[PDB]
Amino acid sequence: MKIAVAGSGYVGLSLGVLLSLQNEVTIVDILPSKVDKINNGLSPIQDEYIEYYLKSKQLSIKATLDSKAAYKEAELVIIATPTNYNSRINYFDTQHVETVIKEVLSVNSHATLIIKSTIPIGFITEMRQKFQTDRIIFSPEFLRESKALYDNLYPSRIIVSCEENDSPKVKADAEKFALLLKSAAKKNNVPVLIMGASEAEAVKLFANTYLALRVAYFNELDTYAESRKLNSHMIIQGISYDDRIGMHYNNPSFGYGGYCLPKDTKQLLANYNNIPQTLIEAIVSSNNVRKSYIAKQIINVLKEQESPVKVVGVYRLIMKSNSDNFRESAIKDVIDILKSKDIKIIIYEPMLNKLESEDQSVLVNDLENFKKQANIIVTNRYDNELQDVKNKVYSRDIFGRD
Amino acid sequence: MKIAVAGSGYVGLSLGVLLSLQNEVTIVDILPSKVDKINNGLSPIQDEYIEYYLKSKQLSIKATLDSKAAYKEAELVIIATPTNYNSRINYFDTQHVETVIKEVLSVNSHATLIIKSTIPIGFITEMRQKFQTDRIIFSPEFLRESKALYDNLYPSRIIVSCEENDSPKVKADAEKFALLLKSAAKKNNVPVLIMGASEAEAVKLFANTYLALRVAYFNELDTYAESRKLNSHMIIQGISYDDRIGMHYNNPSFGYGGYCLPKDTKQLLANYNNIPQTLIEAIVSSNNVRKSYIAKQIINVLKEQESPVKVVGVYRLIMKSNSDNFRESAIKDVIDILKSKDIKIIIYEPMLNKLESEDQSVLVNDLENFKKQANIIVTNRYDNELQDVKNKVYSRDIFGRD
Ligand SMILES: NC(=O)c1ccc[n+]([C@@H]2O[C@H](COP(=O)([O-])OP(=O)(O)OC[C@H]3O[C@@H](n4cnc5c(N)ncnc54)[C@H](O)[C@@H]3O)[C@@H](O)[C@H]2O)c1
Ligand SMILES: NC(=O)c1ccc[n+]([C@@H]2O[C@H](COP(=O)([O-])OP(=O)(O)OC[C@H]3O[C@@H](n4cnc5c(N)ncnc54)[C@H](O)[C@@H]3O)[C@@H](O)[C@H]2O)c1
Ligand SMILES: O=c1ccn([C@@H]2O[C@H](COP(=O)(O)OP(=O)(O)O[C@H]3OC[C@@H](O)[C@H](O)[C@H]3O)[C@@H](O)[C@H]2O)c(=O)[nH]1
Ligand SMILES: O=c1ccn([C@@H]2O[C@H](COP(=O)(O)OP(=O)(O)O[C@H]3OC[C@@H](O)[C@H](O)[C@H]3O)[C@@H](O)[C@H]2O)c(=O)[nH]1
Predict the structure, then answer these.
(1) Which range of residues forms the domain containing residue B151?
(2) A394 and A334 in one domain?
(3) For A238, which of B159, B272, B279 is closest by C-beta distance?
(4) Closest approach of chain A CAs to the CA of B367, in angstroms?
(5) Are B189 and B243 within one domain?
(6) From the list A122, A157, A278, which residue is nearest B285 (CB)?
(7) Backbone angles phi, psi at B217, to 5 degrees
(8) Nearest-CA neighbor of A288 among A254, A324, A321?
(9) How many domains does one find in chain A?
């Protein structure tokens, strides 16, 4: 089968590689660097499995910037373009998904379009009315960055939407896509669910919102533990032995970050409009409150120091353990608040070459100097190469992961 | 060992039975009915395992109302009296725990006192200053009603507190109590944690608050599903296949009820005073909001009916599946709101003999008549004996449990 994938990020790339083993895949992007990298066997993102597959597997995969040439030839088109949350409109800016749908629909009259990009609840229905077709369905993605292909090889579950009154081709394609994902998985018993679009859209948003809920809770517990001078590890460990709570995804941080959790929680809150609820909105504010609290604790550790200048050394900007980006990294909001004061900020981030031209922070990638200059070292996740300056490191990290 | 247990409820009784297998237990209560029942081998509460143990196990257990005679002779005293949340003071009314501590301390100068009752964070420390002793420790209870002894035979974990500067007798007794609970368990690898009192107090409150959090979330998801006319089962099932969320404890209801979740969430919120947070308070308001929403949906189903009188038949008042009490039962708050209108309320509750003398609801325990008179049947958990009036039954129950 010839499949076109719109988007070369974590989602677009892992799906494209995943499906190129027994399908004829063409990935499309609007960045030449990414196309050239793919066509040469290189991943434009750090991913152990994607990297290994591009290099050692036999894949029928090619990249291009010629959208139309790719979409016209396709039997299925998977859209995995960006869907950022836009603060002005109070909603996801869906222009990058809409733009591809229009393009695909203008040069392809048979292909079903499968959206992998996280969208608002009610977007498929809305796109079907706007474009007057039923050839658009949603199949939520549950992958974690740094485990993008891994999570498609060993997925928790597979969900593809289609409506009761959809055409036989679209019902068949929805089923077919679901089974292409199932048979491509190396895991054996992957549950497959076919449900209505809005239901599938909701699943994605509610799943990520629950994960955000979890981090926020353990972060408010941690806020409480630090304020009452209690042993946070002892408390989290004690509540987590209840198998209904679990010992996973429960490591305190400066807040939930990354590309998805931040925006999806906001989207779900907007999709609620005026439906009754208090938790959904609290899940979003909790993150802000946790960030402010962290900044303030840092401010107090600082002022209690006798030094002509107060320097805060920020160790890493990565959004989670092992990450390769800083999207919505919680330490960035903390940094911002700190800047609202008179604190010199130095940042040690190997993965970064230069800070924005106007950034007041100073990038110091010589680790030795970094430690030398920092009065206090602030980091979201602790690292062993900080043992020699251990007593001036502030972090809420307990378990060394996530 | 001679152990005295203050309190004959779910907690006091299951611990007392649990420990009477190899210890000389004496349970104390201020209700003759409960003492007479225990001394004759009967459980004053529905509990399969407690019932079976009283009747078929060899137990060294006796009950009494003579507190002093029991506390003076004891080597350890376990306090499991009530700790209700008091709306006026905005806090747990700890008078029933305090009263036993004082009693025990006045006739016993060697016994360590172990509190199993859920208490405020900082209560042990507070009780130690008030009574000028260190002979008071906390060991949180994690049992579920209807599985009270079961949960002590197969506990998720065991936690007993003691402080670094406690006397050797109290450190030894804390350890000893922990091991009495471990060896009494039929489960093999039960994790044991010894931590500071405040840490242990927090574990209990944070654990129950998380469970309340979970129910509230799935209830707000359900509120959203009913309002947007979506398949709630399809959505919950889709998010629950993520092993990090899980397929457990996720069944929609009219709200979280029972004796513990309602009061513990309020207690934790009070223990936060002004420490920063938004989730903790939202977890409590969410329940109220969910209740109001449910009542309103019922009100709309009602008004859309042509009948001179509008009768709402409430099927059961039990607080959860298989429960034998109605403590903080969510359907009761729903009933209240309904009464705020002009709706005749009839209630079918076999376990109930008479409603309060002033209750405007009418108790109809003939199930046939109940169905005959009810315009709509409202129930927290559906039951098969309602199939013949299925189309007039309103419930958000999906999985038939919890
Ligand atoms: N990243 C995750 O962890 C994750 C997981 C599940 C779902 N999702 C969702 O999938 C979507 C994409 O996320 P991502 O992390 O892969 O993003 P990404 O930023 O890594 O990739 C987006 C890519 O789309 C390309 N692009 C933008 N417009 C295009 C267009 N009009 N035509 C073709 N290519 C275009 C960009 O060049 C970029 O390479 C988002 O909705 C995200 O919420 C993300
Ligand atoms: N019920 C649960 O699911 C559960 C689980 C874990 C912890 N807890 C906590 O344990 C405590 C007790 O809960 P419960 O459900 O067993 O309550 P319960 O109401 O079933 O039992 C309380 C008993 O204490 C007796 N009593 C009151 N004052 C007394 C006194 N001064 N001296 C002796 N006896 C007295 C009452 O007669 C009653 O029989 C509460 O703090 C509760 O929050 C309850
Ligand atoms: O215990 C934890 C877990 C997570 N977090 C934070 O929460 C944020 C998200 O962490 P995740 O590991 O979920 O990382 P990702 O954002 O890559 O994945 C997430 O979004 C995409 C979804 O498809 C994934 O299912 C979801 O896990 C990170 O900033 C992480 O540091 C904590 O602070 N503590
Ligand atoms: O999925 C669920 C689970 C629970 N609930 C509700 O939440 C309330 C609590 O349910 P539980 O099964 O936890 O019952 P219990 O109150 O007996 O146990 C709870 O309190 C005492 C603690 O020690 C236990 O660990 C805790 O589970 C009930 O009203 C129940 O109906 C739901 O509505 N949906």
Answers:
(1) 1-204
(2) yes
(3) B159
(4) 34
(5) no
(6) A278
(7) -70, -50
(8) A254
(9) 3
